[PDB]
Every structure is written in structure tokens, then in C-alpha cells.
Amino acid sequence: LSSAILSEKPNVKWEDVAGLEGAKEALKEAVILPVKFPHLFKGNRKPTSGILLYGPPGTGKSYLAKAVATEANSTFFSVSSSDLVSKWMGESEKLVKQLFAMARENKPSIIFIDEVDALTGTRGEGESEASRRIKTELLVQMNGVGNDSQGVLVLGATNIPWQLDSAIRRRFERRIYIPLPDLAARTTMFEINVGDTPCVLTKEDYRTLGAMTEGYSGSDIAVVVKDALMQPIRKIQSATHFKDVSETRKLTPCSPGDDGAIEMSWTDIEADELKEPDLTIKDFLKAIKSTRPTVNEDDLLKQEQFTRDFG
């Protein structure tokens, strides 16, 4: 049997995710509003049962699922494609039945599924038995004869929504496209991902950054901020020569031959008594020259096709 139970909460708050307030609105009214205000949702007025998120890779879908998982205050299940597909013949499907069953047992609950494109695609006869049996149980077990469709919430994610079948497209009754973040949201993600590190710039300088970075993803922002945090490490471990500055001794990397320039390596230098140089904009522009964006623009044209129709 083994009951396939998996549920754990990380820490990602609301405003960690920047921008796209339609999805924030729909998920606050789909998650917080049923739990905090159950009396409003009564009779004809019912909460949303199936919500699909989609878009290009790294626009913040699974991180938003993390934010819902932290801000849930509910039995947050989560399952990959691993725990559903079993060995023999029968546990591949009865575990789905027990998943939504015990999900309804621990109601109010939220279910997230990542990359539902691995379970769809009934057109043709490829991926035959797994697609028909497992996908059929996802349909009928999602709603069907005597399933309590109230209670639980099914969060779907994908990168390919056009290969998603129209029936499961109707199952995910409120679908939301997640675009590449605009100027202001990327300004916000810059001001978030700098964090507690002492920066040097102002808000309109972050606006200059977001103007320079037209058309990235969230991971692209995470790695240009990472590289911006990782240039002074290369300055400290780099080359030969440090120097004292200023609570008892403190040395930082400096060029060969300078005011107090001893010749050494980071290894030579004592615990703590290292001075790493500030973060800097030059670090930002160096990170811009480091990495090209990952997303392709014809795939964005297909996202504008399915979004322009069904979004």
C-alpha cells in the first residue's frame, strides 16, 4: 500500500514573487479567501477547482508554487511523475486514486503537479497504455461520478500548453499565462535579489538595469545577480597580493605593487580577517556580458498564439 504521502513546506513569502498581479489575485482569492472566509463561498458561489499555470521556462511558475506552499496553511501535497508511475500494472493507477482520496481526507488541501505535459497527449496512439490509463484516471478521478470536487485544488504547470489535450484544458478551468517580466517587475526582482548586500545604486539605476535587460527570465536575473555577488570572490582568491585597510587586521585583494601590498594567497590569510570588496555596477554589466537569455522567440510566438486565443 505505502500510501505515497509527501508534504513539506519551504519558506517563500508573497512579495518574493514580483509582478503579474492577475495570478497573485487569482491565487489569493483561490487559496486565502476560501480558508479565511469560508462563509462567503456557499451554495452557488464555489471556489476554483483547477488552475493551470504555464509559460516559458523560468518565468517563476514553480517558485510561485513554493509561495503558495508556504502561504497555504493547508495540507500541501506535491507529487512528481515519479510517485505515480509504478512497476507492475495496477499500482500505477490506484496510487492516483489514493492520492486524490487522501487529499480529500485532509481537506482543505492544495495539490500541485509540475510539468503535466508528461501525462497528456491522447492524440495518436503513442505512449498508449500509460497515457490512456493514467490520464483517464486523472480525468475521471479529478471529477467524475462521485468525486468530491469541492475541497482540494489542482495546480497545473507546464512549458508546452498546446500539446496539452483540450479535455484536461477544460479540467484546469482557470488558466493563466505567465509572461517574461516587464521593466518594473525586474526592477523589483533586482531590489529583492540584492538582499542584505550593501549595494551602490538608486532605484532609477535599477530602472536603467531593467531597461538594459529587455527580455530575460527570472533565472537570468538570479544568475546576473549571482555573478554580481561572485566577482569579488574572484578578486579575493585571485592572483598574488592583498593589503590591510581600516577591529584588528583586515586585508583585501589589490593589484601588484600598491600601498601596503603584501604578496600572498587567500589560503595564507586568517579566518574572518578577510575583506571582500563591495558589490558594484561594473559587476552588473559584466554579468550582462556573461550570459545570453535562454528563451527562444518563436516559442514566444506560440505562447502568444495559445495565449492570444485561450489566455
Ligand X SMILES: Nc1ncnc2c1ncn2[C@@H]1O[C@H](COP(=O)(O)OP(=O)(O)O)[C@@H](O)[C@H]1O
Contact positions with ligand BEF (CB under 6 A) in 41-60: 57-58
Nearer Cβ to ligand X, position 63 or 239?
63
Give yes or no for residue 15 binding a copy of itself (CB under 8 A). no
Q: Are 65 and 157 in contact (CB under 8 A)?
A: yes
3-state secondary structure of 285: helix
H or E element, residue 212 = helix 203-212
Provide the minimum distance between the beta carbon of 56 and ligand X in the complex, in angstroms, as a whole number. Answer: 8
List binders of a copy of itself among 238-277 (CB under 8 A): 238, 266-267, 271-272, 274, 276
The residue within the footprint of a copy of itself, chosen from 125, 202, 248, 256 (CB under 8 A), is: 125
For residue 58, say whether it is annotated as part of any ligand binding site.
Answer: yes
For residue 122, say whether it is annotated as part of any ligand binding site.
Answer: no
For residue 61, say whether it is annotated as part of any ligand binding site.
Answer: yes
Give yes or no for residue 11 binding a copy of itself (CB under 8 A). no
Q: Please choose, from the candidates 153, 226, 154, the residue with its C-alpha nearest in 3D space to the C-alpha of residue 190.
A: 226
Provide the minimum distance between the beta carbon of 45 and ligand X in the complex, in angstroms, as a whole number. Answer: 14
List binders of ligand BEF among 166-225 (CB under 6 A): 167
Nearer Cβ to Mg ion, position 67 or 279?
67
List binders of ligand X among 136-165 (CB under 6 A): none
Grid cell digits, residue 157: 504547470
Site string for ligand X, 179-218 (x = CB under 6 A): --x-------x--x-------------------------x
Give yes or no for residue 83 binding a copy of itself (CB under 8 A). yes
The separation between CA 48 and the C-alpha centre of its own chain, rounded to angstroms, equals: 22
Angle at 54 between CA 227 and CA 114, to 5 degrees: 80
Proportion of the chain in helix, strand, coil states, percent, rounded to 5: 45, 10, 45
Q: Among ligand X, Mg ion, a copy of itself, none, what binds residue 21 when CB lies within 5 to 8 Å by partner kind? A: none
Return d(Cα 107, Cα 254) in angstroms, integer: 61
Give yes or no for residue 106 binding a copy of itself (CB under 8 A). no
* Residue found by looking up cell 492524440 in the block: 123
Return d(Cα 77, Cα 91) in angstroms, integer: 19
Q: Please choose, from the candidates 174, 159, 124, 168, the residue with its C-alpha nearest in 3D space to the C-alpha of residue 302.
A: 159
For residue 50, say whether it is annotated as part of any ligand binding site.
Answer: no
Which residue is nearest to Mg ion, using beta carbons?
62
Residues that bind ligand X (CB under 6 A): 16-19, 57-63, 181, 189, 192, 218-219, 222
Binding-site sequence positions: 55-62
